[PDB]
Amino acid sequence: SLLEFGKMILEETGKLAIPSYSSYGCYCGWGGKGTPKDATDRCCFVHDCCYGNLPDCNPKSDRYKYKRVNGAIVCEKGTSCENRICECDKAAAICFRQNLNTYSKKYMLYPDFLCKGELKC
Template sequence: MWVMHHTPCFVGSFLPSSCSASLPLSLALGCGGPVSEMAGSSQHPCSLAVLPAAHSSLLNLKSMVEAITGRNAILSFVGYGCFCGLGGRGLPMDEVDWCCHAHDCCYQKLFDQGCHPYVDHYEHAIENNATIVCSELNKTECDKQTCECDKSLALCLQSQTYNEEHRNYLNIYCHGPTPNCSIYEPPQEEAASIHISPEPSAPP
């Protein structure tokens, strides 16, 4: 994203925890989480956090969250719970926190596929401040899936109750086992059925 202290950042665990110590709070709105701690993958470079907004999907996410929830994405979700703020760890505190945890995992899956969701810019539309449409103009699978991840987060946040007591929560108080991203994966049998086409029936 950006290096100025007054530059906006966005909801969810968008940046790796290795970046959080060197970034101002406004830039590290979602550092860490499953991206670096849960999935066991290598941490992503902090250089992803200093690119102009014009080259980042995070501005799209900000507009989604604010249009759908009616809340300021920065003021409402910076430091919310254990996963919408710096360094996700422990058990999510409530359903809003679970939304951010799920978004961390969604991004992690994209990284595993070779995508760069922090900077992959995609096209989308918001109709009547209620419906998010990921555009058919998104040509790459990375763009399409990043849009779907962000759309899911915005809709998830909209459907949950916001708890003011969890705002600006210090994650040093987050305890318990950190849920693994595998909880969002379909059962193996279901996943196999998705990829295996049924054999054609024998001719009569």
């Protein structure tokens, strides 16, 4: 679910999902169009595509379970949708962690008109 994803983000990065990743660049938090602004935005682009691989799942609300094995996120077995949603969220959280070194506040609340053109998943 979106709240679990937010918690995973905070755990991974130490940033609050809202406002750090809810309106960032072209693809974080609301998605749509455009060339992703930077690596963090590409994490969200890929996450959006990941959700898009699951048209009959409901990632905003469906809850999954995961644990930590040392640092590492391990998705625990639920329904097929929950397993796949968890793997999408795990990847995005890891991606955000891997790109914290570039994260730029200038891309928070990024205006929609600066995001044009379709980029295929």
